[PDB]
């Protein structure tokens, strides 16, 4: 469903659309008034359409048959209907400007106008500032739309979000295909997992979210930090963090590579450790330095803590915990004695690793404010033993 929404949505990836004219050659030419084109949602890959049942919706590519998904921009709502303009072989005459031209979106086949649905009262108390977008015969006087440019970084991020979401959803459903179906002495009996594609995508994303080097100069380092924060926020707002968590959980229901092979086969299980390590590294890259993303673990912290004893990705899980604790005081305010005892057991069972000490240090003070509960719990559960 399509809505007119304001606020933080103006900087998110779900408000990005791609204008696709009904031709391949010179599809990048200047847009013209009355030129038929499709409108495609970048992150979801669905095309704006007018259906006989639900009206104005976004449909999949298999249902965009140029009659429901043909729109045009018109300078005014007057029923000109002069003649069908013939396309030229070139850039053509430049007509529609960014941020200055007021455009009216009209469905070509039906002639309806894109407008809001005039939300019913008693819905304002709910805080619903969204207005449903509908196609109407008349519309309103304020139906004109401004076309605003999108940054290359944001466009690339949105397309990457689309592709990554598709790939990881395919991987998740492949994992769920044999969730409780042992293969025995036979094939897993299902489509092959996209192991190589998932590994390459994880590596590409890890390199995409790499923090800027400390040897860079101050101005470009700050610019790169700003871009990294924006990309992390976009990916988080599109649910990629939750998608990574789902992949991690579904791979984590298996204790080891042989246990995974008992269900998916040896050829798939020989990449299980690599994939889980890459998933933890990607999660750390997504949340590193971003307080908004780190604050999401203030509700699910046992999810991270309970995985500290896992032997395949101990360093990655510890790094995720460190990144969470460094940024979010909300997570510090929920730390409990069992969490601290688990972190101490990490020392006891993995040896003298100074990163655990750093994690414990971060548990005490954040942004110049001390947590007496954490300090006392660490002092009580670590010092008197003298071991």
């Amino acid at each position: 469903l399509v809505y007119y929404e304001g606020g933080a949505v103006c900087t998110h990836a779900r408000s990005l659309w791609r204008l696709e004219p009904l031709r391949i050659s010179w599809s990048g030419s200047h847009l013209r008034w009355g030129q038929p084109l499709r409108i495609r949602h970048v992150t979801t890959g669905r095309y704006l359409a007018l259906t006989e049942d639900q009206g104005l919706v976004v449909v999949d590519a298999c249902k965009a048959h140029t009659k429901a998904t043909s729109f045009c921009f018109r300078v005014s709502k007057e029923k000109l209907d002069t003649a069908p303009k013939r396309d030229v072989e070139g850039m053509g005459p430049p007509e529609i400007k960014y941020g200055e031209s007021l455009c009216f979106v009209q469905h070509v086949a039906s002639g309806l106008w894109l407008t809001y649905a005039a939300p019913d009262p008693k819905a304002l108390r709910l805080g619903v500032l969204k207005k449903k977008a509908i196609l109407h015969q008349e519309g309103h006087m304020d139906d004109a739309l401004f076309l605003t440019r999108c940054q290359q970084e944001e466009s690339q991020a949105a397309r990457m979000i689309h592709s990554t979401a598709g790939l990881y959803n395919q991987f998740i459903k492949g994992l769920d295909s044999f969730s409780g179906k042992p293969r025995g002495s036979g094939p897993p009996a299902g489509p092959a997992l996209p192991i190589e594609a998932v590994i390459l995508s994880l590596q590409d994303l890890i390199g995409y979210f790499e923090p800027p080097s400390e040897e860079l100069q101050h101005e470009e380092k700050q610019s790169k930090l700003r871009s990294l924060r924006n990309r992390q926020s976009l990916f988080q707002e599109e649910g990629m963090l939750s998608l990574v968590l789902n992949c991690i959980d579904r791979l984590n229901v298996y204790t080891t590579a042989a246990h995974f092979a008992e269900y998916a086969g040896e050829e798939a299980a020989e990449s299980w450790k690599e994939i889980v390590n890459l998933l933890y590294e990607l999660l750390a890259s997504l949340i590193r330095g971003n307080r908004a993303n780190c604050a999401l673990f203030s509700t699910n912290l046992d999810w991270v803590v309970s995985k500290l004893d896992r032997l395949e990705a101990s360093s990655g899980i510890l790094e995720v915990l460190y990144c969470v604790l460094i940024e979010s005081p909300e997570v510090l305010n929920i730390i409990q004695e069992n969490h601290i005892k688990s972190i101490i057991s990490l020392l006891d069972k993995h040896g003298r690793n100074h990163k655990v000490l750093d994690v414990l240090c971060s548990l005490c003070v954040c942004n110049g404010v001390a947590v007496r509960s954490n300090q006392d719990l660490i002092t009580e559960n670590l010092l008197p033993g003298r071991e």
């Binding site: 941020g99 605003t148 440019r149 940054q151 101050h218 101005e219 700050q222 930090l225 700003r226 924060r229």
Partner: protein
């Protein structure tokens, strides 16, 4: 209570000492003058005895003033939600600004000498990154009014006075290479936060000054707490003076850049923003005139509010004139298609009626002169 009040010699020693401290700092320390800005800038502008090697070090590591400017630029470029208050930057910005001006038939020789002296004093700053620091701080304030942005604007005016073409070129080049929208977003927000005349606040102030209240420890004679009518008049004046100085000398490139920013992802029309503020100011002035139309003589508070509004209007008119002079045909067309005509119609109405009203009593001749020069 005047006839029964307590003499000073009966007060407790500590109370009298506190009163003496207040009086002494008010009348003896504040009144003291000590010009150290020029001496500080001269001391910081010297590189100390590092010229006995003259090797390929010609990178020429910054002198102390340059390092201070770079430090302030660094703290301005840090990514933060808000621009925090910084008394050190405040004080050093005031020092740099006061270092640059240092100012009945002046002859041409000493006129040009004053011009070259001002040019050199401005060069001492804009050869060390002050012009970029000003823009970075304006962008970092993100359109939040405050003493930090006021100090930044005063420094910008101080280094742009007289229409310094070199500083204008440096600022324009920096803006065009950075292609950041934060600068003009902050400028637009600041211009939208500028206030105009408020009749409700004027009436509240009239009632407050009519009540005549005093304090506990002693008795205050009509305390002069902050004016709430056009409180930020000096800030509005310095903002529009900065915008005018960006275009001073008929800088066609900057006049066009204020109207449209080609390289940026989004564009803000500062000319139209100025027209909008002029409309709001004109409406406020018309409301004030309607308030005082019935009364025969305007009192002192109304006269002073009228004078400060007129000064703000003078600055806005000068800014628009600097936008369009040269001429800048794009700015001329943009103004011709704006509500400038409506603002001028309202101003003509106010001008005619205020001249006719003020001409009937000689106690308002100064206000009439101010109105005439505004016309």
């Amino acid at each position: 209570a005047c006839f029964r009040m307590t003499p000073l010699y009966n007060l407790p020693t500590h109370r009298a000492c506190n009163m003496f401290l207040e009086s002494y700092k008010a009348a003896w320390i504040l009144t003291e003058d000590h010009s150290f800005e020029d001496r500080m800038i001269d001391d910081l502008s010297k590189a100390g005895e590092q010229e006995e090697e003259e090797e390929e070090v010609e990178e020429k590591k910054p002198d102390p003033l340059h390092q201070l400017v770079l430090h302030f630029s660094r703290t301005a470029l840090t990514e933060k939600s808000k621009l925090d208050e910084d008394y050190l930057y405040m004080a050093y910005a005031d020092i740099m600004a006061k270092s640059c001006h240092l100012e009945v038939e002046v002859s041409f020789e000493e006129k040009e000498m004053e011009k070259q002296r001002l040019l050199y004093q401005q060069s001492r700053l804009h050869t060390r990154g002050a012009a970029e620091m000003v823009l970075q701080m304006i962008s970092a304030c993100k359109g939040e009014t405050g003493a930090m942005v006021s100090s930044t604007l005063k420094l910008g005016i101080s280094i742009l006075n007289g229409g310094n073409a070199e500083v204008q070129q440096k600022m324009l080049d920096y803006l065009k290479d950075k292609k950041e929208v934060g600068f003009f977003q902050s400028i637009q927000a600041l211009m939208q936060t500028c206030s105009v005349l408020d009749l409700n606040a004027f009436e509240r102030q009239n009632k407050a000054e009519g009540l005549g209240m005093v304090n506990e420890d002693g008795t205050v004679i009509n305390r002069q707490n902050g004016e709430k009518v056009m409180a930020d008049d000096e800030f509005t004046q310095d903002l529009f003076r900065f915008l005018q100085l960006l275009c001073e000398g008929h800088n066609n490139d900057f006049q066009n850049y204020l109207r449209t920013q080609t390289g940026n992802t989004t564009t803000i029309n500062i000319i139209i923003c100025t027209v909008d503020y002029l409309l709001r100011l004109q409406e406020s002035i018309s409301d004030f005139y309607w308030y005082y139309s019935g009364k025969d003589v305007i009192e002192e508070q109304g006269k002073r509010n009228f004078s400060k509004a007129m000064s703000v209007a003078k600055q806005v008119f000068n800014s628009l004139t600097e936008y369009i002079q040269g001429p800048c045909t794009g700015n001329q067309q943009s103004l011709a298609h704006s509500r400038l005509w409506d603002a001028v119609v309202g101003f003509l109405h106010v001008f005619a009626h205020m001249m006719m009203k003020l001409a009937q009593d000689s106690s308002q001749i100064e206000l009439l002169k101010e109105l005439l020069d505004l016309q």
